A paper describes a structure:
PAPs that can hydrolyze phytate are known as PAPhy (Dionisio et al., 2011). Here we show the X-ray crystal structure of the b2 isoform of wheat PAPhy induced during germination. In keeping with other HMW PAPs, TAPhy_b2 consists of a smaller fibronectin type III (FN3) non-catalytic N-terminal domain (residues Pro43–Thr156) together with a larger C-terminal MPE domain (residues Arg168–Glu497). The high-resolution crystal structures of the wheat purple acid phytase isoform b2 reported herein provide a straightforward explanation by highlighting the roles of two sequence inserts (PAPhy motifs) relative to a canonical MPE domain in forming phytate-specific substrate specificity pockets.
To validate our assignment of specificity pocket contents in TaPAPhy_b2, we turned to site-directed mutagenesis of predicted active site residues. Basic residues were chosen for alanine mutagenesis if they were found less than 6 Å from the predicted position of the bound substrate and were conserved in PAPhy but not in the non-phytase HMW PAPs. This process identified two residues highlighted from analysis of the MD trajectory, His229 (Pocket F) and Lys410 (pockets B and C), and one other, K348. The relative phytase activities of the mutants were <5% for H229A and 13% for K410A. On the other hand, the H229A mutant showed highly attenuated activity toward phytate. Crystallization of this mutant allowed its structure to be solved at 1.50 Å resolution, which proved it to be essentially identical to that of the wild-type enzyme. However, a region of discontinuous electron density was identified between residues Asp216 and Pro227, covering most of the PAPhy 4 motif. The lack of structural order in this region of the mutant enzyme can be explained by the deletion of a π-stacking interaction between His229 and Tyr218 following mutagenesis. Such interruption presumably results in instability of the PAPhy 4 motif, emphasizing the importance of this motif in phytate binding and recognition.
Author numbering: 1 to 18, 23 to 215, 228 to 508
């Protein structure tokens, strides 16, 4: 039987230390495998409730370089035919289409515009049920997809859970990414959470050379094409990271992220692609924005207060959050970088009994002991960071507590969001300092390996967490495993 959080924190563990190569545009998996207006990059996303889901896809090739001419999204329809059997696609839904462009008004830089992106919401679905579907435009010969299938989340209730939820972040599109995704797919998750930093298109110049701020947007299309075997069969929920900012003409940001994925923004009443909520069985998930105003006077905070007040913990016992930047990572990389977000939101989330937090951003794996306001606390959330999806940026290997590695405080805050909130500790072992001189006691486990996690919620009190390292391929391999046990009578 696996160990558990029920008997308190564990003594910290650091796994001793042991670039990825981006997939080339010659890889058949990233090339166009369809012609004309046939769908590609097909992806399923959850709605706010299990009884609805989104199907999205792109029709038409992108344009890169020269005098790009954005496509008219009204010229290709957005239709999904679906049903309970592969030969019985008797239900129909329609949606809307859009394009986005990536434009730079500087000599020598190249412009991009997308294929036509489609988003269709299916309503009136049975929970826990396999649906077969085709997408495309039935009025254009050859413009319908093959038949695909996905399974809706189980019905919302305290003993009803998806079997496995995969959690990844900072995938990029390297050969190590393919290892992460293959490991994940072999675990047959019912749901994928992607905690920001998707394609790493901004590691390229517009002319395709791999390193104002620039991107090579075709990496998004390569990513979407590579991921389609997963996303067309498995719902995937994405939240933005800093690599999605992709600032362009007129200060426009997040164009690719906001256009490409479906989010339950309207259904969960966030009306933002950057944060939203949804239920999957008895789990209420909140995806938060580390890169949209998170201050107590802002819209995201107001939405979050409203969202939390509606959660009934007898219906959804589990309250789980995801966002890009960790609050309790002990690596030097991005150490205390999101402190202002923690200071803004942590007390609100603690007051509502947040159970688990998943993040990315730090290119390594870390699991915290239960913690609130830098204090080990039996009612604090477990913070797990899985930004180790395999992108081409350097792995995080140095720890802030390593001798001589404590960063200068003023160098740590996120420059995009601004502010400084990371003051020296005033109590505990590290009182008077910015960092510890050994692994902090709120850090249970940290390892500089690529991998993915699987969450298996069992009932209203127990969830089994497993993290799998990419370099282990044998059956049943697991790097870190623990039962996360909640105590609602104690903490709520
Ligand atoms: C919610 O799910 C958890 C996890 O499945 C339940 O706890 C688990 O309950 C089973 C059955 O009582 C325990 O199995 C027993 O484990 C011992 C070894 O520890 C073994 O010798 C027995 O033959 C038997 O297999 C299991 O240990 C226990 N696991 C943990 C971490 O507590 C829990 O009871 C469920 N709660 C509700 C309200 O349903
Ligand atoms: C890219 O688009 C911007 C805005 O329309 C324009 O200023 C620029 O000239 C374009 N660059 C090229 C090579 O077409
Ligand atoms: C990334 O993949 C390469 C090639 O398979 C492998 O040699 C390397 O060890 C992987 N890197 C990590 C940190 O696992
Ligand atoms: C892309 O632009 C950079 C910076 O000017 C340049 O160094 C590089 O050689 C260019 N790559 C190509 C394929 O033109
Ligand atoms: C772009 O951002 C700067 C501030 O960073 C601002 O001065 C400027 O007015 C903005 N331009 C537009 C079109 O919003
Ligand atoms: C967190 O700890 C600091 C210093 O002890 C304290 O000033 C602050 O009020 C605490 N924040 C809470 C309880 O939300
Ligand atoms: C905070 O701690 C660092 C060492 O981590 C130290 O250099 C610095 O002087 C401290 N700042 C204050 C105001 O105490
Ligand atoms: Fe990041």
């Amino acid at each position: 039987e696996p160990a558990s959080t029920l008997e308190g924190p564990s003594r910290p563990v650091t796994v001793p230390l042991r670039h990825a190569v981006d997939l080339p545009d010659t890889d058949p998996r990233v090339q166009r495998r369809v012609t004309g207006w046939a769908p590609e990059q097909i992806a399923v996303a959850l709605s706010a409730a299990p009884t609805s889901a989104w199907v999205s896809w792109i029709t038409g090739d992108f344009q890169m370089g020269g005098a790009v001419k954005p496509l008219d999204p009204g010229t290709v329809g957005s239709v999904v035919r679906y049903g309970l059997a592969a030969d019985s696609l008797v239900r129909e839904a329609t949606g809307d289409a859009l394009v986005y462009s990536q434009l730079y008004p500087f000599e020598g830089l190249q412009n991009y515009t997308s294929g036509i992106i489609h988003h269709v919401r299916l309503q009136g679905l049975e929970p826990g049920t396999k649906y077969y579907y085709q997408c495309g435009d039935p009025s254009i010969p050859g413009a319908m997809s093959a038949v695909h299938a996905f399974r809706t989340m189980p019905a919302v209730g305290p003993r009803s859970y998806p079997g496995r939820i995969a959690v990844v972040g900072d995938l990029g599109l390297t050969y190590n990414t393919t290892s992460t995704v293959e490991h994940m797919a072999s675990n047959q998750p019912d749901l994928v959470l992607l905690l920001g930093d998707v394609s790493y298109a901004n590691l390229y110049l517009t002319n395709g050379t791999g390193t104002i701020a620039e991107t090579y947007q075709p990496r998004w299309d390569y990513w979407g094409r590579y991921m389609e075997p997963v996303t067309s069969s498995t719902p995937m929920m994405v939240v933005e990271g800093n690599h999605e900012i992709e600032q362009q003409i007129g200060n426009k940001t997040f164009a690719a992220y906001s256009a490409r994925f479906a989010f339950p923004s309207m259904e969960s009443e966030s009306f933002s692609p950057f944060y939203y909520s949804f239920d999957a069985g008895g789990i209420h998930f909140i995806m938060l924005a580390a890169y949209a105003d998170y201050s107590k006077s802002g819209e995201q905070y107001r939405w979050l207060e409203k969202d939390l007040a509606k959660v009934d913990r007898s219906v959804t016992p589990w309250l789980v959050a995801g966002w890009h930047a960790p609050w309790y990572s002990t690596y030097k990389a991005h150490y205390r970088e999101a402190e202002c977000m923690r200071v803004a939101m942590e007390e609100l989330l603690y007051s509502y009994g947040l159970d688990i937090v998943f993040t990315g951003h730090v290119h390594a794996y870390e699991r915290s002991n239960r913690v609130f306001n830098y204090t080990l606390d039996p009612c604090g959330a477990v913070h797990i960071s899985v930004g180790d999806g395999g992108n081409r940026e350097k792995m995080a290997t140095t720890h802030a507590d390593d001798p001589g590695r404590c960063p200068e405080p003023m160098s740590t805050p996120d420059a995009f969001m601004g502010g400084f909130c990371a003051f020296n500790f005033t109590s505990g072992p590290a009182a008077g300092s910015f960092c510890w001189d050994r692994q902090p006691d709120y850090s249970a486990y940290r390892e500089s390996s690529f991998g993915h996690g699987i969450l298996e919620v069992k009932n209203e009190t127990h969830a089994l967490w497993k993290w799998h390292r990419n370099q282990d391929l044998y059956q049943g391999a697991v790097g870190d495993e623990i039962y996360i046990v909640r105590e609602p009578e104690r903490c709520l």
